[PDB]
């Protein structure tokens, strides 16, 4: 949201 | 008292400012080993989608395992110009990997924070990432 980082983890980056 | 086995991997990307990958394009690290597990890191310098285009994404891929699924936590951090691990983020818990499967942070670090020389994250135009993998043993 403008944040330096977001902690959400996700998959299937391909 | 689960049995966890931790190991650390360092990957340095050279001439990082000069990367021409765009949204969706990936840079893969070389494969690394933990116990017969093989891993690699995937980096999207400019994310994966319009959403994350202002961010660098970072993902952990399982390349090989000797049974079916692997359970692991992972921590990504960046080496700064003072010699310190910076901006660490970890999975709060273990994720389920199979061969071919990545897990990671689509929004790992804002590009304009990374490129800000004041934050010391690209010494000599090199981006050095650490990945600590914590594999839960069956
Ligand atoms: Mg390189
Ligand atoms: Mg390299
Ligand atoms: Mg390419
Ligand atoms: Mg920090
Ligand atoms: Mg899940």
Numbering used by the authors:
A (entry chain B): 1364 to 1377
B (entry chain A): 26 to 59, 63 to 166
What does the paper say about this structure?
SPOP recruits substrates via its N-terminal MATH domain, whereas a central BTB domain mediates dimerization and interactions with Cul3. Here, we show that MyD88 interacts with SPOP through a long degron that contains the established SPOP-binding consensus and an N-terminal site that we name the Q-motif.
We found that the search motif is present in six additional known SPOP substrates – GLI family zinc finger 2 (GLI2), DEK, steroid receptor coactivator-3 (SRC-3; also known as nuclear receptor coactivator 3 (NCoA-3)), sentrin-specific protease 7 (SENP7), SET domain-containing protein 2 (SETD2), and Caprin1. We crystallized SPOPMATH in complex with the 17-mer substrate peptides and obtained high-resolution structures of SPOPMATH in complex with SRC-3, SETD2, and Caprin1. The SRC-3, SETD2, and Caprin1 peptides all interact at the SPOPMATH substrate-binding groove with the same overall backbone conformation as MyD88. In the N-terminal region, the backbone atoms of peptide positions −3,–5, and −6 make identical hydrogen-bond contacts with main chain atoms of SPOP Lys135 and Arg138 and with the side chain of SPOP Tyr83, respectively. At the −4 position, the SRC-3, SETD2, and Caprin1 peptides all contain a glutamine residue corresponding to MyD88 Gln130, and the side chain of this residue makes identical contacts with the backbone carbonyl groups of SPOP Lys115 and Tyr136. The SPOPMATH hydrophobic pocket (SPOP Phe136, Ile137, and Phe141) encompasses the side chains of peptide positions −4 and −5.
